[PDB]
Design an enzyme around this catalytic site. Structure first.
Site, PDB file in Angstrom:
ATOM      1  N   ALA C  38      34.568  39.626 -72.896  1.00  0.00           N
ATOM      2  CA  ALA C  38      33.480  40.493 -72.379  1.00  0.00           C
ATOM      3  C   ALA C  38      32.159  40.158 -73.084  1.00  0.00           C
ATOM      4  O   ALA C  38      32.442  40.164 -74.165  1.00  0.00           O
ATOM      5  CB  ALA C  38      34.127  41.763 -72.396  1.00  0.00           C
ATOM      6  N   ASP C  39      31.203  39.849 -72.133  1.00  0.00           N
ATOM      7  CA  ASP C  39      29.965  39.674 -72.696  1.00  0.00           C
ATOM      8  C   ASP C  39      29.227  40.845 -73.404  1.00  0.00           C
ATOM      9  O   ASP C  39      29.997  41.916 -73.497  1.00  0.00           O
ATOM     10  CB  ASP C  39      28.975  38.975 -71.856  1.00  0.00           C
ATOM     11  CG  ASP C  39      28.837  39.816 -70.707  1.00  0.00           C
ATOM     12  OD1 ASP C  39      28.227  41.158 -70.902  1.00  0.00           O
ATOM     13  OD2 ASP C  39      29.046  39.187 -69.382  1.00  0.00           O
ATOM     14  N   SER C  40      28.230  40.803 -73.940  1.00  0.00           N
ATOM     15  CA  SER C  40      27.377  41.945 -74.648  1.00  0.00           C
ATOM     16  C   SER C  40      27.444  43.153 -73.452  1.00  0.00           C
ATOM     17  O   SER C  40      27.754  44.222 -73.909  1.00  0.00           O
ATOM     18  CB  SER C  40      26.221  41.490 -75.212  1.00  0.00           C
ATOM     19  OG  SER C  40      25.535  40.846 -74.343  1.00  0.00           O
ATOM     20  N   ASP C  42      28.905  43.335 -71.011  1.00  0.00           N
ATOM     21  CA  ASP C  42      30.015  43.744 -70.280  1.00  0.00           C
ATOM     22  C   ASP C  42      30.853  44.721 -71.248  1.00  0.00           C
ATOM     23  O   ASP C  42      31.448  45.495 -70.620  1.00  0.00           O
ATOM     24  CB  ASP C  42      30.949  42.362 -70.084  1.00  0.00           C
ATOM     25  CG  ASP C  42      30.887  41.987 -68.725  1.00  0.00           C
ATOM     26  OD1 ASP C  42      30.381  42.580 -67.810  1.00  0.00           O
ATOM     27  OD2 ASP C  42      31.581  40.824 -68.478  1.00  0.00           O
ATOM     28  N   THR C  43      30.724  44.550 -72.357  1.00  0.00           N
ATOM     29  CA  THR C  43      31.227  45.615 -73.828  1.00  0.00           C
ATOM     30  C   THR C  43      30.399  46.659 -73.387  1.00  0.00           C
ATOM     31  O   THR C  43      31.103  47.894 -73.543  1.00  0.00           O
ATOM     32  CB  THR C  43      30.898  44.963 -74.944  1.00  0.00           C
ATOM     33  OG1 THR C  43      31.331  43.633 -75.103  1.00  0.00           O
ATOM     34  CG2 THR C  43      31.679  45.932 -75.869  1.00  0.00           C
TER      35      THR C  43
END
Lengths: 386, 51, 85, 51, 82, 319
Positions: C38-40, C42-43
């Site tokens: 999970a990207d930034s 996405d987090t």
């Protein structure tokens, strides 16, 4: 510790294999579902004679065996007829030994005591359901019983895990093991997998029946003489190295190996039941089985091997111990007697058990039919699969 | 709960709660088998296990 | 306030998996969101979904330090305990 | 009639209710709805009945 | 003596199932309430040891003070200055 | 009941059901077939009571014959044993042997349950409660014991009249062992002429309750010996009771005759007759019958009574 007849013929070995299961199932019939501490106080002189006053749900008459030995006898007769394992004829003989009378209320009310999963399987294959779709009708409750176990941890028999991982797979695999004794191991495994194709398809039930049948095969091969072949440690090592693949089965068999003291010759059963040897045996049995009920295949096979090997050299003591262990007493004593008969021929069965088998409701003709099934099991040839 | 679990032929546990109703004790819901020993039978094994 | 941390962790794992695409198995307690990829942003979307599912306000100061699924469930369970007051 | 969760094994619950009359059962379902409200649910579960 | 036998058996069971007892304690602390299946799962996952008998026969306390059935049997003050 | 049975009024079972419907009103559901505990307990107690009744009908003959055993719950009870009530004038007077037989018949049900299960139960509690009261009436009031060397104790609890009951709960009819209990007892009725005696001291109360324990131990050992020697007949009767629910005393007599005692058990089976004796303590048995009475603290509490000194000086140390 080697009985007496150091060389036993195949005829005697197979008739003993049938008759040990017979006397175990008859002797331990009224103690199904009871626990060991209840049994040793009900029979304070020991479980050494056939009981005449069963008062339970389906009172077993004097000298009468249950549906577990009925299935074992049907398996032996069908295997002797087919010279191997053919599931269609196996289920034909199983149903012929099942539909012997009752009351169609239609659960048919079987004449002898039957396991709930065994009754369900036989009713399903008599109700037109094909004998390969196990979860189509065998997951009646079972999965719902697991969903209902979410708020209870009972040891009540109604909550015992009866299903494809039951003990009925391994209770009737001893005739298969004795027939496939000299035909190798892999062919025996294939025969067992063919035998349990309609009732117990799980790897746990497969491993339980595999252990039992392999032990039966081994016992048939060795003779009660010198300790080179007569060794419970060697039997356990062979089973662990060649037959035991699953984790729980492996762990129970190593838990057996580590422990397994040898029981002394017992005369006063009242004094033995209040002794350190019986205390250690019950402690190991409670470690190998949940609350005295070894419903799972691994626990049942480990309990059978414990009762057979802890009293090595005294098959009568083995059968009495397996009868007095309670729980699934008739099937456990039947399997212990079947293994003891694959080891020793028809010379260790006492005349009291002979007369009780003969003078019962399933007597005379029944006892000689068991003897004839043993004769056919000795005389059947397979030529490594036929 | 542990010693009711490891005692054979005991009343089985339905639930175990710590401080129910903010009450400074726990509570284990024990379920009896009426068909086993009706409402009249007590054995020495049951009494000693209860102790 | 005696929050059922097992239930909180199970639902947190379910939310994380549901958003990302993995099964409930892959979402393990000790697993880092970075492992799941999970990207930034996405987090951040996962934290928003957790807020929406639990109907609570996430502790802003400390959201930069949500690394493990266990940490996310622990901060969430602490907030569920602190909500009732 | 009322709103309960359908995944309830009413047999296991009735086993836990050994020794009850029928109005006792009725009132236990009423207070089970009360415990459902306490936990924050409109439907009654077997957990709510045990509580 | 019956109370002593029951207490000895209870301490014996809690001592031989110490790890399962600690795990059940931590589970009760974390969850507040717990069901029968979770209790069974925790105790079976922590390697519990069951009682072969429900009787306290043979259990008790020795006169010196040690437990019974713990696998041992079977069936001047300082007077300085100020 | 004969009409609903689909036949004429033959056999005594319909008559007994008609009697039971109004003496022990209604019919409860039967004992469950799930688990072997209740069917065994509420057959073993009645089988043992009927067996002990038959054995005491032998030798002595004071115990009346057994009419029937039911074990089908019909109102306020789970099992019964009916006794063929003998003629009156046999109940107008309580004899020592009759009271001993009644104590044995009381203990019989609990000790039969214990013999069947191999385990003590709570079934002995009611039997012990009845037998202790009967033994206290045996020792104190009637004076049938040997307390003091002739059986006359210094204290006895004479029963009072029913006119002081006031409440008088209306059970009505039936008339159980009350017919043997109140018929021989003569109550007080007149408070102006009530004798109660001084309450005995702790030492003599210890001796008298020891005599009561001796009577209970003797009756209990006799009952346990009977039930140990007739295990086969008891088990056959239990199986017949579980199979046929209700059963008559006639058919029970046929079953018990068909399964007699095995003469001499010699060994193994002899170990049931052995260790069937009780380990209960009789304090004043042998040498403990002069003054300490097996009490190590009595000399630290009671300062040596005058008649005790007379016993230890005139009799002892002067023979």
């Amino acid at each position: 510790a080697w009985r007496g007849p150091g060389e036993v013929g195949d005829e005697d070995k197979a008739v003993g294999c049938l008759l040990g299961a017979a006397v175990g199932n008859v002797l331990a019939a009224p103690y199904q579902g009871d626990r060991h501490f209840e049994v040793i106080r009900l029979r304070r002189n020991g479980v050494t004679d056939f009981w005449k006053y069963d008062i339970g749900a389906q009172p077993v008459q004097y000298g009468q065996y249950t549906g577990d030995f009925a299935n074992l006898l049907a398996v032996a007769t069908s295997l002797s007829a087919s010279r191997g394992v053919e599931p269609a004829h196996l289920l034909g003989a199983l149903t012929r030994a099942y539909a012997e009378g009752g009351s169609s209320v239609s659960g048919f009310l079987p004449a002898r005591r039957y396991s709930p999963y065994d009754r369900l399987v036989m009713d399903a294959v008599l109700a037109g359901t094909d004998p390969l779709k196990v979860p189509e009708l065998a997951e009646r409750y079972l999965a719902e019983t697991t969903r209902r176990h979410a708020s209870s941890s009972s040891d009540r028999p109604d909550r015992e895990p009866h299903g494809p991982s039951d003990l009925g797979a391994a209770a009737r695999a001893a005739p298969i093991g004795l027939a496939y004794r000299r035909a190798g191991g892999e062919r025996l495994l294939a025969a067992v997998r063919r035998s349990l194709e309609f009732s117990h398809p799980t790897p746990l039930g497969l491993d339980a029946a595999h252990v039992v049948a392999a032990a039966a095969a081994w016992c048939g091969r060795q003779q009660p003489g010198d300790a080179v072949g007569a060794t419970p440690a060697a039997l356990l090592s062979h089973l662990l190295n060649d037959v035991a693949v699953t984790a729980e089965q492996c762990g129970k068999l190593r838990l057996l190996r580590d422990n397994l003291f040898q029981l002394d010759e017992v005369t006063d059963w009242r004094a033995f039941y209040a002794g350190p040897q019986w205390a250690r045996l019950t402690a190991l049995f409670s470690r190998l089985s949940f609350h005295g009920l070894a419903t799972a295949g691994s626990e049942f096979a480990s309990v059978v091997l414990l009762a057979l090997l802890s009293s090595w050299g005294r098959p009568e003591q083995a059968v009495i111990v397996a009868a007095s262990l309670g729980g699934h007493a008739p099937a456990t004593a039947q399997t212990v007697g079947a293994l003891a008969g694959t080891l020793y021929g028809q010379s260790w069965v006492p005349e009291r058990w002979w007369r009780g088998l003969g003078e019962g409701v399933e007597g005379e003709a029944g006892r000689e039919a068991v003897v004839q099934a043993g004769r056919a099991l000795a005389a059947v040839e397979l030529a490594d699969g036929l | 709960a542990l010693l009711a679990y490891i005692t054979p032929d005991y009343e089985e546990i339905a639930r175990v709660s710590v401080c129910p109703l903010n009450v400074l004790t726990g509570f284990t819901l024990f379920v009896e088998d009426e068909d086993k020993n009706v409402n009249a039978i007590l054995t020495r094994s049951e009494l000693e296990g209860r102790m | 306030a005696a929050v059922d941390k097992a239930k909180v962790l199970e639902d947190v794992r379910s939310i994380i998996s549901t958003q990302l695409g993995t099964e409930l198995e892959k979402v393990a307690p000790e697993a880092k969101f970075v492992d799941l990829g999970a990207d930034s942003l996405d987090t951040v979307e996962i934290m928003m979904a957790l807020e929406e599912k639990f109907e609570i306000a996430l502790e802003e100061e400390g959201a930069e330090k949500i690394a493990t699924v266990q940490d996310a469930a622990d901060m969430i369970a602490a907030q569920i305990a602190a909500k009732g007051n | 009639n009322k709103a309960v969760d359908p995944n309830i094994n009413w047999y296991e619950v009735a086993r836990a209710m050994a020794g009850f009359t029928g109005a006792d059962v009725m009132g236990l379902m009423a207070r089970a709805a009360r415990m459902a409200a306490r936990q924050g649910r409109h439907a009654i579960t077997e957990d709510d009945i045990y509580a | 003596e019956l109370l002593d036998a029951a207490e000895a058996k209870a301490m014996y069971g809690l001592a031989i199932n110490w790890r399962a007892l600690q795990a059940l304690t931590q589970a009760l602390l974390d969850r507040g309430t717990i069901t029968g299946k979770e209790v069974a799962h925790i105790l079976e996952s922590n390697g519990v040891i069951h009682f072969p008998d429900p009787y306290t026969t043979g259990f008790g306390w020795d006169p010196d003070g040690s437990l019974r059935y713990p696998f041992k049997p079977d069936t001047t003050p300082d007077l300085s200055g100020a | 009941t004969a009409v609903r049975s689909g036949r004429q009024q033959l056999t005594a079972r319909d008559i007994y059901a008609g009697v039971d419907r109004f003496t022990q009103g209604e019919v409860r559901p039967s004992l469950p077939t799930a688990h072997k505990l209740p069917v065994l307990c509420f057959a073993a107690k009645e089988i043992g009571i009927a067996l002990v009744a038959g054995e005491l009908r032998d030798r002595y003959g004071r115990v009346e014959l057994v009419e029937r055993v039911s074990i089908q719950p019909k109102g306020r009870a789970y099992s019964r044993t009916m006794f063929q009530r003998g003629t009156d004038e046999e109940y107008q007077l309580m004899t020592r042997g009759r009271l001993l037989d009644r104590i044995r018949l009381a203990l019989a049900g609990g000790f039969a349950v214990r013999t069947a299960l191999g385990e003590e139960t709570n079934f002995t509690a009611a039997d012990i409660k009845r037998a202790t009261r009967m033994a206290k009436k045996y020792v104190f009031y009637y004076g049938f014991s040997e307390a003091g060397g002739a059986g006359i104790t210094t204290w006895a609890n004479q029963p009072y009249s029913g006119d002081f009951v006031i409440g008088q709960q209306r059970a009505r009819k039936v008339v159980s062992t009350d017919a043997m209990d109140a018929f021989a007892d003569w109550p007080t009725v007149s408070e102006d002429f009530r004798f109660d005696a001084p309450s005995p001291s702790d030492v003599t109360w210890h001796r008298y309750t020891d005599e009561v324990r001796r009577v209970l131990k003797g009756c209990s050992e006799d009952v346990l010996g009977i039930l140990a020697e007739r295990q086969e007949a008891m088990w056959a009767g239990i199986k017949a009771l579980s199979d046929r629910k209700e059963l008559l005393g006639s058919e029970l007599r046929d079953i018990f005759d068909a399964h007699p005692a095995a003469t001499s058990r010699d060994r193994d089976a002899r170990a049931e007759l052995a260790a069937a004796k009780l380990d209960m303590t009789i304090f004043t048995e042998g040498a403990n019958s002069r003054w300490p009475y097996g009490i190590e603290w009595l000399d630290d509490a009671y300062p040596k009574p005058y008649w005790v000194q007379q016993q230890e000086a005139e009799a002892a140390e002067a023979q």
